Amino acid sequence: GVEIETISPGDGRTFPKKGQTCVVHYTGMLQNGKKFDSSRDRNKPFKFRIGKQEVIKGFEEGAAQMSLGQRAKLTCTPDVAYGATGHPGVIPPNATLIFDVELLNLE
Template sequence: MLLLREMGVEVKTIKAGDGKTFPKQGDLLTMHYVGTLKDGTKFDSSRDRGKPFQFTIGVGQVIRGWDEGVMKMSLGEKAKLEITSDYGYGSSGAGDVIPPNADLDFEVCFRLKSSMFV
């Protein structure tokens, strides 16, 4: 298992990607994910909905831990993102689902990339 650390986010590779196709700021990404609290409680899953999540990387559409962690993944990679609360939802939390100051884990699979700047 490959491990990459940044402040606030740790990327643990579960399955290697192609090693050459990395997202750039402004790319539209399609990913599956499962989000859990540190105690293992699942709070969200694109897999449960049967529809992958699409977002633009590096423009603040997602939490900072995703913006920074996913940028280190290559196409096809499956990884676990371990995100500290300051790179997640911080002292606010997220509704009744994510408590304040919660560290989060996401199992993510980087499936598709398309550039918005063509």
């Protein structure tokens, strides 16, 4: 259950590939519009690698469908999110998440 809505277009030619590192800014908010985390609060990007399950399967699938420079709104249903367990202290159980993510660079 991954839904991608385009906010600002990118170059449309460059895509993340397996084995390399994605550098993104992300803004994670619940389905009700409440924000809980964002890298822009820290003024540094978030680095993760494709294919090594460093992030939840919902976030990884959306990032692979984004182009370099593209910024899009992602929907993370609980099946491709923390699910029934949630995350202690942040995410209520069975919560759907919305991520606003901008791809800056790929290595």
